[PDB]
Amino acid sequence: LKQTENDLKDIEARIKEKAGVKESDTGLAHPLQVARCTKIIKGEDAKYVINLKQIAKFV
Amino acid sequence: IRIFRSELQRLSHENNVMLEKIKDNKEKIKNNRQLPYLVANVVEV
């Protein structure tokens, strides 16, 4: 069990780190304590683009 | 019906000259404006 969970970083975590980080950090960006978006253009309807940080607030 | 149709064709064609001119401008004026607008307040005009 000890050696089984050691090599999971090269196998299982490669997909986990891609869907759990790279997708969340895409474009300088499930309990959510933080959300960020930078320069997102989407055609009013599902626009969002909200920065939870006190710096550069959006509407 | 005779003289008016001669001058109408010139004004109608010139209206198409600015039509193709604004057609590329309408695409630029909408695209150059950044959709994710940021909140700001002008202190001095």
Swiss-Prot record, chain A:
Kindly list the residue ranges recorded as spanning the membrane: none
The superkingdom listed in its UniProt entry is: Eukaryota
State its location(s): Cytoplasm; Nucleus
Bridged cysteine pairs (disulfide): none
Modification after translation is described as: The N-terminus is blocked.
Q: What does this protein do?
A: The 26S proteasome is involved in the ATP-dependent degradation of ubiquitinated proteins. The regulatory (or ATPase) complex confers ATP dependency and substrate specificity to the 26S complex.
- Look up the further comments and give them: Present with 105 molecules/cell in log phase SD medium.
Describe the family membership recorded for this protein in Swiss-Prot or TrEMBL.
Belongs to the AAA ATPase family.
Subunit composition and interactions? Interacts with UBR1 and CIC1.
Q: What is this protein called?
A: 26S proteasome regulatory subunit 7 homolog
> What organism does the UniProt record list as the source?
Saccharomyces cerevisiae (strain ATCC 204508 / S288c)
Q: Which residues of the full protein are shown?
A: 49 to 156 of 467
Swiss-Prot record, chain B:
- PTMs? N-acetylated by NAT1.
Identify the stretch annotated as signal peptide in this record: none
Cell compartment(s), UniProt: Cytoplasm; Nucleus
According to its UniProt entry, the function of this protein is described as: The 26S proteasome is involved in the ATP-dependent degradation of ubiquitinated proteins. The regulatory (or ATPase) complex confers ATP dependency and substrate specificity to the 26S complex.
Could you say which protein family the record assigns here? Answer: Belongs to the AAA ATPase family.
Q: What name goes with this protein?
A: 26S proteasome regulatory subunit 6A
Give the source lineage, highest ranks first.
Answer: Eukaryota, Fungi, Dikarya, Ascomycota, Saccharomycotina
**Which residues of the parent chain are present?**
41 to 85 of 434
